[PDB]
Amino acid sequence: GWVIGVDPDIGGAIAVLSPDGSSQVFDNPFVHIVVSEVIRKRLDTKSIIQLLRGLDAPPGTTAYIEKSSPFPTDGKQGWWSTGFSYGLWIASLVASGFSVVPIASQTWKAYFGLMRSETPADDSRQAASILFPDKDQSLKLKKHHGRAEALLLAAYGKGLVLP
Amino acid sequence: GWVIGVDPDIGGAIAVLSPDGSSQVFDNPFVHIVVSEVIRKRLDTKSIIQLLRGLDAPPGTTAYIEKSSPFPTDGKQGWWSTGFSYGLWIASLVASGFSVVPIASQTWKAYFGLMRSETPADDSRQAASILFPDKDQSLKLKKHHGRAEALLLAAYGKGLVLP
DNA sequence: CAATCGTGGGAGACTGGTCTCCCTGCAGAT
DNA sequence: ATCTGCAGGGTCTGGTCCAGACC
DNA sequence: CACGATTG
Ligand SMILES: [Mn+2]
Ligand SMILES: [Mn+2]
Ligand SMILES: [Mn+2]
Ligand SMILES: [Mn+2]
């Protein structure tokens, strides 16, 4: 009963669920780098691999990762970034011994009843708070939706249900 | 002593230069996958990590990889792929214990005097044929320019010079 | 299979149709 | 530090920005 | 560079 969930974007997170029901969630490590004479956030490859190497989850644990699906109206830098983040995470997960299962955002949203909300990020945090009450304090900021998404991905993969 | 050169695109390659002067070059592994009801080529994450595991190059060996730099006129799918291929390779290389150094294409081209050619692919293969004569049969086809690019990147890292 | 060409493009889940979904990169306000 | 709003965008290297190059 | 063709 080990499951990993990964929201791969720059404000994303990785959640780890263990057989005893406990949970962990880590913000995606990033660094500030210079691109075309401005500052950009990019995921921190070496920190991600060290994080994955430090997990207690055994080899073969399944990691559910949100499928990249940039909108056609998103700009070309958005497409590059979502592609880059996805490839960095997939390779790090495979290299660390995990079985990687891409999941569409539509799949886990429909599973928890979060399709077509007016406030989708607030709702994600509320749903994750109910599934993981001991994470309640770690979900109270609006910027914490990435943590919520990672936890709901993992919850999906484990088959948890809302009460 | 040991140097790795990576041309990360879908027709790219990885070259490995041993201290005894011998060289190897491998085509980037890929699979065919379905995206939006059409077939696409995508780099094969599992094969890439197995290839890196099988190399004799010791940990800490430097891997030179061409920096991603898509043109603004390239479409958003081009930006996504070059982003994805770059992230996949960088994470694979770090996870396998290699030290990663991104090199702009302008840098290794100017170093071998290949700037501003009317036939840049052909010239790359000729330059790599001269630097690595035992790879001459592996460079006869025009689609082998990715092999040439990987070898030239590695040659740049090693400080080799054309005669 | 290997080469060449022209243009720059969503993708996904539930016999095609339909409808839903992610961001990045800046800026400014507090 | 945190939130919100709007539009969708190159980046790099050699030599105080410019110029010219590249996938 | 990708992508989706077409040409021997
Ligand atoms: Mn997400
Ligand atoms: Mn997210
Ligand atoms: Mn290249
Ligand atoms: Mn290439």
Numbering used by the authors:
A (entry chain B), B (entry chain A): 109 to 271
How did the manuscript describe this experimental structure?
Holliday junction resolution is a crucial process in homologous recombination and DNA double-strand break repair.
To capture this transient metal ion, we mutated a critical residue K229, in vicinity of scissile phosphate. K229 is conserved across the RNase H superfamily that includes RuvC. Crystals were soaked into Mn2+ containing solution over various durations prior to X-ray data collection.
